[PDB]
């Protein structure tokens with residue numbers, strides 16, 4: 001059964017609620033983004049209205065085969081009326097097509113649902129600047145002060161410089177990047193661009209990237225592996241055995257692999273700085289774990305919430321244990337007392 005934190009009270013709306021069968025009284029199902037834990041349950045047999053971004057709608061149509069008649073794409077930054085209720089979609093700074101949703105309830109209450117997001121000061125000059133938000137449904141993935149990591153720009157600078165140095169020293173080196181979902185496309189696109197290469201990948205991954213429908217990505221991707229010196233593989237293959245196996249298939253074209261595993265936060269962030277990061281190495285294979293996050297750091301989250309000044313916060317991540325729930329509630333109270341309430 002559908003949990004309380006996925007229902008929007010005083011409406012017929014749910015958010016990211018496709019794995020619970022027919023939800024009683026739900027007239028419209030919102031989907032914040034195309035990640036599997038959020039879309040779980042959608043297929044060609046779904047017959048209720050789905051509201052989402054254009055990019056999310058492209059993925060629903062082509063990857064999950066949802067019928068066109070049930071897909072309702074909405075433009076960003078635009079007041080829209082859905083089943084008698086004013087809504088706005090805002091960029092979430094997560095993966096491609098990811099949104100936050102502002103709901104203007106009939107009773108005068110205003111709700112912001114962040115979906116998954118990476119909070120940024122630029123959100124302080126969105127349509128959020130205008131008015132009061134009563135309730136915030138918050139992506140609390142990294143809601144603890146130990147969760148630190150660098151900016152996306154700093155991580156990409158490291159990856160570009162590392163890859164360019166390696167291939168300039170050894171023109172016969174291959175670069176490999178791991179993936180298991182949409183998001184983090186900058187890692188492989190930025191490396192390919194500096195090396196003057198397209199990114200080679202499976203037909204299935206090519207299809208997914210096409211669905212994003214953006215010319216710059218299309219110009220840098222191919223299914224012809226032999227023509228490319230940056231290859232994408234499933235994240236599960238980014239290990240010494242998997243990479244050894246892959247190098248055999250390349251027909252003596254390469255004699256070294258440099259590989260990148262984009263992760264989220266890992267405990268090595270507590271000790272090491274991005275500039276001091278070193279790889280795991282075995283013979284002619286090296287693997288770098290790089291902390292490229294598409295979720296807010298603790299400090300980014302705190303800044304956003306202290307700016308927004310919501311009356312109530314409902315966490316949507318780490319909700320399963322009493323320890324997690326208690327810890328998050330203590331941070332929200334600290335932030336409030338500091339902020340002057």
Ligand SMILES: Oc1c(F)cc(F)cc1-c1cc[nH]n1
Nearest residue numbers: 096184185186189214216217
């Ligand atoms: O995600 C992107 C990326 F990684 C590289 C790029 F050039 C463009 C995008 C993008 C996202 C939405 N519109 N365009």
Ligand SMILES: Oc1c(F)cc(F)cc1-c1cc[nH]n1
Nearest residue numbers: 306309311312332335336339
């Ligand atoms: O955390 C808050 C903050 F930083 C500023 C603010 F105005 C309110 C809160 C809050 C916490 C729980 N309910 N409201």
Ligand SMILES: Oc1c(F)cc(F)cc1-c1cc[nH]n1
Nearest residue numbers: 321322323324325326327328
């Ligand atoms: O363990 C707990 C529990 F069972 C119930 C509860 F409300 C809180 C906790 C907890 C643990 C650490 N901090 N808070």
Ligand code: NI
Nearest residue numbers: 033035094116
């Ligand atoms: Ni996500």
